Design a protein around this ligand. Structure first.
Ligand SMILES: CNc1ccc(-c2nc3ccc(O)cc3s2)cc1
Ligand SMILES: CNc1ccc(-c2nc3ccc(O)cc3s2)cc1
Lengths: 61, 61, 61, 61, 61, 61
């Protein structure tokens, strides 16, 4: 009943240096799902299902 | 009943330096889902399902 | 009953330097969904489903 | 007698991403020379003495 | 007599990502020479003495 | 007499990622020479004395 947050950090990314020399990149998706190339990403959920880089499947019923 | 937030951080990205030399990039999607190239992204949800870079599937019923 | 926020940050992006030298970029979508090239994006939801870069599927019923 | 330059590069800087978060910077020079903070600099000399960031001395005769 | 340069590179810097989080920087020079903080610098000399970041001395005669 | 350079590289720096978290930096020079903090530097000399980060001495005569 006296919660005290201070200087806290949650789902935090900082201080990222990145060099990506690539002569070629290619995704050839044929009918499917694909996720590629996530970098320096931060989420924070409450009462929820939190996905960052999901390759979810073809739901059939 | 005396919640105190201070200097808190949640779903936070900061201080990102990025160099991307690429002679070619290509996504050849044929009928499918694709997500590519997410960088320095921040979310924060409450009472919700939070996805960042999802490749969700073809819902069929 | 005495909530106190101060200097808080939520879904925040700051201090991003980005160089992207690319001789060619190409998305050849044929009938599908595609999301590409998200950079320095910030969201904040309450009582809602928050997606950032979703490749959602062809809902059929 | 048939010199051929092509796509050459000399004294060249390119593709530099830089983030500099600093809460304080200070140079307190008292009577002296100082050089600070050179970034992404390019020179090219011919028949000459080329200095980039020199702290040269008090010439006395 | 048939010199052929092609795609050559000389004194070249490229593709540098740098993050510098510093709570304090300070140079307290008292009567002397100082050089600090050179980053991503490129020179090219011909028939000359080339210095990049010299701390040269007090010439006396 | 048929010199052929091609795709050569000389005094070349490339593809450098650097993160420098420092709570304090300080140079307290009292009457002397100092060189500090050289990063990603490239030189190329011909018929000359080439110094990069010299701490040269007090020439007296
Ligand atoms: C399950 N994760 C979760 C996170 C956070 C919470 C709550 N945060 C607050 C803030 C103020 C207030 O008057 C009521 C509430 S309830 C509840 C659940
Ligand atoms: C000692 N380092 C050195 C480097 C280079 C050279 C020369 N480069 C060229 C280019 C063209 C030309 O007609 C004459 C010359 S001489 C000489 C000496």
């Amino acid at each position: 009943v006296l919660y005290v947050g201070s200087k806290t950090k949650e789902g935090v990314v900082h201080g990222v240096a990145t060099v990506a020399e690539k002569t070629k990149e290619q995704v050839t998706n044929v009918g499917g799902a694909v996720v590629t190339g996530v970098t320096a990403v931060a989420q924070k959920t409450v009462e929820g299902a939190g996905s960052i880089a999901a390759a979810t499947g073809f739901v059939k019923k």
